[PDB]
Amino acid sequence: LSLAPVNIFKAGADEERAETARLTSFIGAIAIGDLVKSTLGPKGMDKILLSSGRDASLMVTNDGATILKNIGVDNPAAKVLVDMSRVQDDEVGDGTTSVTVLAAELLREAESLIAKKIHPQTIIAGWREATKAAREALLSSAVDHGSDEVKFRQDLMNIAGTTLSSKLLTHHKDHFTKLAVEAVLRLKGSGNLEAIHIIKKLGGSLADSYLDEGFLLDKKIGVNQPKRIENAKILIANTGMDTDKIKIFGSRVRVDSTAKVAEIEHAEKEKMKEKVERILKHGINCFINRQLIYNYPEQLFGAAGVMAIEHADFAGVERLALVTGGEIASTFDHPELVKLGSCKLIEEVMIGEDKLIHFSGVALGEACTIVLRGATQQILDEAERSLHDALCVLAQTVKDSRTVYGGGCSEMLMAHAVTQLANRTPGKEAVAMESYAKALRMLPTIIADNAGYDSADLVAQLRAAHSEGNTTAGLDMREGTIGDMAILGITESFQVKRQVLLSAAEAAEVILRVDNIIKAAPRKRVPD
Amino acid sequence: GKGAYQDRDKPAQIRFSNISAAKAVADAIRTSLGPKGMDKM
Ligand SMILES: Nc1ncnc2c1ncn2[C@@H]1O[C@H](COP(=O)(O)OP(=O)(O)O)[C@@H](O)[C@H]1O
Ligand SMILES: Nc1ncnc2c1ncn2[C@@H]1O[C@H](COP(=O)(O)OP(=O)(O)O)[C@@H](O)[C@H]1O
Ligand SMILES: [Mg+2]
């Protein structure tokens, strides 16, 4: 009467057979895609996350990658969709909400097909011919640019104003689009997104943010050292000025008189003087170090009129070698094989209540800093998080410059290619192919559902316009009607839409093949 | 026209629970304001 008279497993271990395992994996995946659906589209809403054990850290976010990383799920099939969402954020940085909704709509349409007595291996084999016919019809519809500067710049402005839409930055979209497109062109083709330092601080409105022409450092200068020096020659170094060079051996002093100790002590103090004099042979007036500088060499730099900046980590030394143009130097033995930096004015600025070192007038300027101002701490965190999605997707368009019309036009495009294929192949796979084309057409439905429009009427108009020739038709969310995509300026990235189909089709394939869930005995937690 | 049925009451009851929480904090420090406001300890 029970699950076999004999006992195979231990106490606390559970097993699920075919008819109940499909029930757990299908309600677990739909639950994930229902919480996230509300944050999709230009008019998506926003969530609140409170921690119960992490000292009550209140964070407010919109993207569907930080929400899943925070929600603690115990469902085995819901952990796959949280992992695939993290990989999307770490690959292209945009499209986490769309990859989870699509992979959750494929599973919903695969439960009504099992109820029609269709083997799961039939659905999977029928979906493989649907993804192949969908990625061919998207590549053929891409517009390759980059041969003209006046055209490539207009393509990057449209991408930036499309990503910032669902995010809190959409209020000041005209201002944060120029800060997001100019900071990427400063990299001069290098994909090093770490070079952009986002400094956030309280006070001021969201409209007070700007992109500084030079550089900013949150460090301090030594005592009684010049605050400003015009036409500086910066030397970037990484050398140990702490106490003295310890000279790592197993050595010790074994003198027999206390006067001989005083002579050795005077030998250390003349060791650091020689090191400082070898630095000054370069003819500099701005020494920058990545370690601490003690009280002896601090006065030696201040007697010759040299600015010393101490305790700047790797993040602030690698960046300063790309801005001014110097090199990270050590051993100070050949002044002719080293290259110095350059500036035009260095001063101290007052942003709020803190002082920062300002670099006005630079040679290269391959790295920059962005100053974010806001009312609350949650706005600063969300502005930084949203701005990072604009920089990540603009670093991909420069390497692979081809764009695909978005705003619902791309989803209906691939959905029509599957329909024409499903009307050709005989057998049961014609039923499985229509489900794939049915799941792609609900992405535009959710966008129009959040805005309160008649979704069932707009999809019918789009499907009828995409089967007659109009390949650029899409949703117009500012009015509620149907508008062209090549006129309004709704543009996306080709790599982002390609990674959504391939990721959401693999996760729906791994989950669908499962027919037995075996759970081990959970590790118990010691209460006392 | 009578479309756009709203089948979810969670957003309505949450937006109303934010109003009552914020309005309650403003009522707490209303007394200490102006040249004749008292002090809290
Ligand atoms: N101004 C707009 N008009 C119409 N559709 C838009 C607009 N901006 C964004 N979208 C659409 O909203 C969808 C979701 O974007 P969003 O929620 O911002 O990030 P994610 O792509 O990670 O979900 C995209 O597929 C895009 O086509
Ligand atoms: N002598 C006064 N007579 C009338 N109004 C005053 C007087 N002094 C201050 N106020 C007003 O009281 C308002 C609130 O001040 P108060 O509650 O003391 O501190 P806060 O400005 O931080 O709220 C101010 O906007 C000011 O115009
Ligand atoms: Mg996005």
Swiss-Prot record, chain A:
EC number assigned by the record: 3.6.1.-
Binding site for Mg(2+): D94
Modified sites of kind N6-acetyllysine: K10, K151, K178
Keyword Transferase assigned: no
Compartments where located: Cytoplasm
Coiled-coil region: none
Signal peptide positions on this chain: none
Cross-link (Glycyl lysine isopeptide (Lys-Gly) (interchain with G-Cter in SUMO2)): K245
GO biological process terms held by the UniProt record: binding of sperm to zona pellucida; chaperone mediated protein folding independent of cofactor; chaperone-mediated protein complex assembly; chaperone-mediated protein folding; positive regulation of protein localization to Cajal body; positive regulation of telomerase RNA localization to Cajal body; positive regulation of telomere maintenance via telomerase; protein folding
GO molecular function, one term: ubiquitin protein ligase binding
GO CC terms, sorted: azurophil granule lumen; cell body; chaperonin-containing T-complex; cytosol; extracellular exosome; extracellular region; microtubule; zona pellucida receptor complex
Source domain of life: Eukaryota
Pfam families (alphabetical): Cpn60_TCP1
Annotated residues for binding of ADP: G41, G95, T96, T97, S98, S165, S166, G407, E492, K497
Keywords from the named record: Acetylation, ATP-binding, Chaperone, Cytoplasm, Hydrolase, Isopeptide bond, Nucleotide-binding, Phosphoprotein, Ubl conjugation
Modified-residue entries (Phosphothreonine), positions: T258
Annotated catalysed reactions: ATP + H2O = ADP + phosphate + H(+)
Family the entry assigns: Belongs to the TCP-1 chaperonin family.
Oligomeric form and interacting partners: Component of the chaperonin-containing T-complex (TRiC), a hexadecamer composed of two identical back-to-back stacked rings enclosing a protein folding chamber. Each ring is made up of eight different subunits: TCP1/CCT1, CCT2, CCT3, CCT4, CCT5, CCT6A/CCT6, CCT7, CCT8. Interacts with PACRG. Interacts with FLCN. Interacts with DLEC1. Interacts with SVEP1.
The protein's role, per its UniProt record: Component of the chaperonin-containing T-complex (TRiC), a molecular chaperone complex that assists the folding of actin, tubulin and other proteins upon ATP hydrolysis. The TRiC complex mediates the folding of WRAP53/TCAB1, thereby regulating telomere maintenance. As part of the TRiC complex may play a role in the assembly of BBSome, a complex involved in ciliogenesis regulating transports vesicles to the cilia.
Protein name as catalogued: T-complex protein 1 subunit beta
Natural source organism: Homo sapiens (Human)
Gene: CCT2
UniProtKB/Swiss-Prot annotation, chain B:
Record-listed ADP binding positions: G34
Residue numbers of Phosphoserine PTMs: S17
Subcellular location, record wording: Cytoplasm; Melanosome; Cytoplasm, Cytoskeleton, Microtubule organizing center, Centrosome; Cytoplasm, Cytoskeleton, Cilium basal body
Modified residues (N6-acetyllysine): K2
Residues bound to ATP: G34
Known disease link: De novo genetic variants in nearly every subunit of the TRiC complex, including CCT4, have been found in individuals with a broad spectrum of brain malformations, and clinical phenotypes ranging from mild to severe epilepsy, developmental delay, intellectual disability, ataxia, and other features of cerebral malfunction.
UniProt function note: Component of the chaperonin-containing T-complex (TRiC), a molecular chaperone complex that assists the folding of actin, tubulin and other proteins upon ATP hydrolysis. The TRiC complex mediates the folding of WRAP53/TCAB1, thereby regulating telomere maintenance. As part of the TRiC complex may play a role in the assembly of BBSome, a complex involved in ciliogenesis regulating transports vesicles to the cilia.
Assembly: Component of the chaperonin-containing T-complex (TRiC), a hexadecamer composed of two identical back-to-back stacked rings enclosing a protein folding chamber. Each ring is made up of eight different subunits: TCP1/CCT1, CCT2, CCT3, CCT4, CCT5, CCT6A/CCT6, CCT7, CCT8. Interacts with PACRG. Interacts with DNAAF4. Interacts with DLEC1.
Family under the similarity heading: Belongs to the TCP-1 chaperonin family.
Name of this protein: T-complex protein 1 subunit delta
Organism: Homo sapiens (Human)
The encoding gene: CCT4
